[PDB]
């Protein structure tokens, strides 16, 4: 065996220190995989680590995708070609500040206990592995690839103590032909280590933490000694920055201090920098944090204050680590990192616009039923959902209430905006004075702002989006609903020839020519809320609450010559022109 875990890591009979950086293939465009992997190599590090996102690879049950932006095999091959080893964490649940922690949303339509030894759930994970694992097994080092070892579950000690669950996953991997060493990662204290591991069954244990390697490793060492294990020390996630959430201030970490904290790990064991290069949560795939009953959604940018910025350029922190390495670990060869240049344009004018209500039928085909349905039971995972019904008014003024809706609701009557309610505001009284004669159109646009990816709210009832109970008018729930799923995966269907109306959700088109594609940032600091596309590719979410006020556009999303940017904006605040900038626009908080 080329890679062994004993009293130490051994690669080809020789003692080996793992120097790893996290780069999620699904967060960096494929055209920059080489760039980012090169820059990890140039740091003097020897290994790349990545999660695998189940929700991306099986977006609908039984429908699998492993090409293009999802070509994990190619990501791994470029790594090997650059002479990098790999650690893969293929857990059904990856946390990762990622939608539903990586779990497919269609699971919410299933009768199963997600993330447990429930066989209904295990079976699903099995079918997923039946597709994923055969692609990774040939890429094990022993088999001629570069994969050193793989993770079982992910910080399971911060969720449960179901050992049968951990054993089931390990078993599934083994019988699919995974013969490399397997391991768990957890918080480095007793409670999480006990609950999250199979140490008594010889399953390798790693710790996750972002400082104080000496103390944390000692807790790990004490745990190993307790079980008679003579094992190397590895930090499977050394949090070197952090993620950002809407409305919350961007907080960076001192490059030098991070540099020193990393040194402390390397002196005692191995490391995987989380993140090395963080990249972006394109489209609707951002995750969400929880505090008690409250959800706190995470931003589109996964810059993370990582070594490489969102775009993939080295930072003070990268340079500070390069120097810490050249000073304290000079035996590890270094190189010069690659840089990309960003481009800059001013005032690309508005060509065309259209209200959602006007282009609604080319975008979406409605589902009708007596009672309102939830997003996932309609077959939708991500995006927006429009509930439509008709009702006449039975009094000069009437009260409307959305009962058990999530995450954000905008209510219109005959096209006129009445109210917007976010999270815990949903359910509050809405008062309306409607036409005395005839049916009036009640439209409620719902947005899924990202399913919680961790902890006690992981399987809360609020994880199913849309209206779960109903909409009350006076004292009775309204019936006869038309549902328009709006995943907005079909931006080519937006009909800009139809009408536009102030104070409504709408699409705004901006055209421009590009001579040579270069990275750049869409300035959206004067738009309210929504998503943006470039040549039909969903860039992710914007929101003027900050801290981020821009969307990053990779050079590879642009095309020589004519380009089209499209902005879906829901608040009614837009601009007749857009700026593309060199540097992202930030809101001070």
Ligand X SMILES: OC[C@H]1O[C@@H](O)[C@H](O)[C@@H](O)[C@H]1O
Tell me how far, at minimum, the Cβ of 163 lies from a second copy, in Å: 9
Start-to-end CA distance of the chain, whole Å, equals 53
- Piece in contact with ligand X (CB under 6 A), picked from 12-20, 36-44, 235-243, 357-365: 235-243
Among 243, 318, 508, 574, contact with ligand X (rule: CB under 6 A)? 243
Instruction: Tell me if 395 contacts a second copy by CB under 8 A.
Output: yes
| Cβ nearer to ligand X, comparing 298 with 364 | 298
Is 481 among the residues that bind a second copy (CB under 8 A)? no
Smallest separation, CB 257 to a second copy (Å):
27
In whole angstroms, the minimum distance from the beta carbon of 186 to ligand X comes to 9
∠ Cα 230 234 237 (to 5°): 155
Q: Nearest Cα to 138, choosing from 72, 204, 69, 202?
A: 72
303 lines the binding site for ligand X (CB under 6 A): no
Is 148 or 306 the residue whose CB approaches ligand X more closely? 306
Nearer to a second copy by C-beta: 25 or 156?
156
Of 223 and 521, nearer to ligand X (C-beta) is 223
Other Cβ atoms less than 10 A from the Cβ of 325: the count is 22
Site for a second copy in 84-113 (CB under 8 A): 113
Tell me the window of 39-47, 88-96, 218-226, 402-410 that interacts with ligand X (CB under 6 A).
88-96
Residue 406, strand partner residues: 466
DSSP 297: E
Chosen from a second copy, ligand X, none, partner binding at 154 (C-beta under 5 to 8 Å by type): ligand X
CA distance to 459, 462, 560, per residue, from 293 (Å) = 12, 9, 48
Q: Are 324 and 259 within 8 A, CB to CB?
A: yes
Indicate the residue among 143 and 469 with the shorter CB distance to a second copy: 469
Taking the complex as a whole, the smallest distance from the CB of residue 493 to ligand X amounts, in Å, to: 35
Residue at shortest CB range from ligand X = 95
237 catalytically annotated: yes
Does 237 contact ligand X by CB under 6 A? yes
Q: Which residues pair with 172 in a beta bridge?
A: none
Non-local (6+) Cβ contacts of 290 within 8 A are 296, 452, 454, 455, 456, 457, 460
Question: Quick one: DSSP state of residue 516?
Answer: S
Q: Which is nearer to a second copy, 436 or 588 (CB)?
A: 436
**By the rule CB under 8 A, 290 interacts with a second copy:** no
Instruction: Please report how close the Cβ of residue 395 comes to a second copy at its closest, in angstroms.
Output: 6
The beta-carbon contacts of 71-75 under 8 Å, at least 24 apart in sequence, are 71/25, 71/30, 72/25, 72/135, 72/136, 73/135, 73/139, 74/30, 74/33, 75/25, 75/30, 75/33, 75/50
Name the catalytic one among 97, 155, 311, 358: 155
- Regarding 191 and contact with a second copy (CB under 8 A), the answer is yes
* Of 32, 58, 97, 519, the one binding ligand X by CB under 6 A: 97
Identity of the residue, 151 or 192, whose beta carbon is nearer to a second copy in the bound complex: 192
| 96 lines the binding site for ligand X (CB under 6 A) | yes
Q: In whole angstroms, give the CA distance from residue 69 to residue 66.
A: 8
What's the min distance (Å) between Cβ of 154 and ligand X?
5
Q: How far is the CB of 410 from ligand X (least distance, A)?
A: 30
Q: How far apart are CA 469 and CA 161, in angstroms?
A: 33
Q: Does 32 contact ligand X by CB under 6 A? A: no
Distance (Å, whole) CA 255 – CA 305: 10
Q: For a second copy, what does the binding mask look like between residues 362 and 381, x meaning CB under 8 A?
A: --------xx----------
Instruction: Considering only residues 107 through 166, tell me which ones interact with a second copy, judged by CB under 8 A.
Output: 113, 116-117, 157-162, 164
> DSSP characters for 310-378?
TTS-B-HHHHHHHHHHHHH-TTS---PPP---B--EEEEEEEEEEEHHHHHHHH---EEESS--BTGGG
User: Could you say whether residue 315 binds a second copy (CB under 8 A)?
Assistant: no
Active-site residue, selected from the candidate residues 58, 97, 99, 237: 237
Residue whose CB is less far from a second copy, 31 or 161: 161
Q: Does 307 bind ligand X (CB under 6 A)?
A: no
Number of residues that bind ligand X (CB under 6 A): 10
Residue 440, strand partner residues:
391
Q: Return the residue matching tokens 């009408």.
A: 499
For residue 290, the minimal CB distance to a second copy (Å) is 11
Scanning residues 523 to 582, which ones bind a second copy (CB under 8 A)?
none
Instruction: Report, in Å, the least distance between residue 109 CB and ligand X.
Output: 25
161, 495, 520, 573 from 528: Cα distances, Å:
44, 22, 20, 5
DSSP state of 245: B
Pairing of strands 520-523, 577-581: antiparallel
- Structure tokens belonging to residue 567: 């902005």
- How far apart, in whole angstroms, are the C-alpha atoms of residue 68 and residue 327? 39
Total residues at the site for a second copy (CB under 8 A)?
43
216 binds ligand X (CB under 6 A): no
Residues whose CB is less than 8 angstroms from the CB of residue 269 and which lie 6 or more positions away in sequence, other chains included: 17, 213, 217, 232, 233, 234, 235
Binding to ligand X in span 143-162, by CB under 6 A: 154-155
Out of ligand X, a second copy, none, what residue 487 binds, judged by CB under 5 to 8 A for its kind, is: none
- By DSSP bridging, strand 204-209 and strand 234-239 are parallel
Write 219-223 long-range contacts (CB < 8 A, 24+): 219/188, 219/189, 219/190, 219/193, 220/188, 220/193, 223/190, 223/193, 223/199
Q: Is 155 a catalytic residue?
A: yes
Site residues, ligand X (CB under 6 A): 94-97, 154-155, 208, 237, 239, 243
Active site residues: 155, 237
Site residues, a second copy (CB under 8 A): 113, 116-117, 157-162, 164, 187, 189-192, 194-196, 292-293, 370-371, 394-395, 398, 401, 403-404, 427, 455-456, 459-461, 469, 472-479
């Amino acid at each position: 065996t080329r890679f062994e875990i004993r009293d130490d890591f051994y690669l080809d009979g020789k003692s080996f220190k793992i120097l790893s950086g996290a780069i999620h293939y699904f967060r960096v465009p494929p055209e920059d995989w080489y760039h980012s992997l090169y820059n990890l190599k140039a740091l003097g590090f020897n290994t790349v680590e990545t999660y695998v996102a189940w929700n991306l690879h099986e977006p609908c049950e039984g429908e699998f995708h492993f090409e293009g932006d999802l070509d994990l095999e190619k990501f791994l091959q470029i790594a090997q070609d650059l002479g990098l080893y790999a650690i893969v964490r293929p857990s059904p649940f990856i946390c990762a500040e990622w939608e539903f922690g990586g779990l497919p949303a269609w699971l919410l339509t299933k009768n199963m206990r997600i993330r447990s030894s429930d066989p209904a759930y295990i079976e699903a994970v099995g079918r997923y592995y039946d597709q994923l694992l055969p692609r990774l097994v040939p890429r094990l080092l022993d088999n001629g690839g570069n994969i050193l070892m793989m993770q079982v579950e992910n910080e399971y000690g911060s969720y449960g103590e179901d050992k049968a669950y951990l054993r089931a996953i390990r078993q599934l991997m083994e019988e699919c032909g995974v013969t490399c060493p397997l391991f768990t990662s957890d918080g480095p204290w007793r409670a999480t280590l006990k609950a999250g591991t199979l140490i008594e069954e010889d399953l390798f244990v790693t710790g996750n933490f972002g400082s104080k390697a000496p103390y944390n490793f000692s807790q790990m060492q004490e745990f190993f000694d307790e079980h008679g294990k003579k094992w190397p020390l590895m930090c499977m996630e050394f949090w070197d920055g952090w993620f950002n959430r809407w409305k919350e201030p961007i907080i960076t970490r001192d490059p030098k201090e991070l540099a020193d904290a990393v040194r402390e790990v390397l002196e005692q064991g191995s490391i995987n920098l989380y993140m090395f290069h963080g990249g972006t949560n394109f489209g609707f795939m951002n995750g969400c944090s929880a505090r008690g009953t409250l959800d706190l959604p995470q931003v589109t940018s996964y810059d993370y204050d990582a070594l490489l910025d969102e775009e993939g350029n080295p930072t003070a922190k990268y340079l500070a680590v390069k120097k810490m390495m050249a000073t304290h670990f000079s035996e590890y060869p270094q190189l010069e990192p690659l840089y990309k240049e960003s481009m800059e344009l001013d005032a690309i004018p508005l060509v065309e616009k259209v209200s959602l209500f006007e282009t609604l039928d080319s975008l979406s085909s409605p589902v009708e039923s007596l009672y309102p349905q939830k997003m996932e039971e309609l077959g939708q995972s991500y995006g927006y959902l429009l509930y439509r019904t008709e009702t006449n008014w039975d009094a000069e003024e009437e009260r409307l209430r959305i009962i058990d809706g999530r995450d954000r609701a905008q209510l219109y009557v005959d096209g006129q905006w009445v109210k917007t309610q976010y999270q815990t505001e949903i359910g509050e009284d809405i008062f309306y004075q409607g036409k005395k004669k005839g049916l009036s159109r009640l439209d409620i646009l719902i947005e899924n702002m990202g399913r919680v990816n961790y902890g006690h709210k992981f399987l809360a009832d609020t994880q199913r989006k849309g209206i779960r109970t109903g909409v009350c008018k006076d004292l009775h729930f309204l019936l006869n609903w038309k549902h328009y799923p709006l995943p907005l995966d079909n931006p080519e269907k937006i009909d800009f020839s139809k009408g536009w109306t102030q104070g409504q959700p709408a699409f705004y088109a901006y055209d421009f020519t590009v001579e040579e594609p270069k990275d750049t940032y869409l300035d959206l600091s004067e738009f309210g809320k929504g998503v943006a596309f470039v040549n039909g590719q969903n860039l992710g979410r914007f929101w003027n609450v900050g801290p981020t006020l821009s969307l990053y556009i990779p050079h590879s999303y642009l095309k020589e010559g004519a380009n089209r940017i499209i902005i879906f904006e829901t608040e009614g605040q837009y601009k007749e022109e857009i700026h593309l900038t060199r540097k992202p626009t930030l809101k001070h908080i």
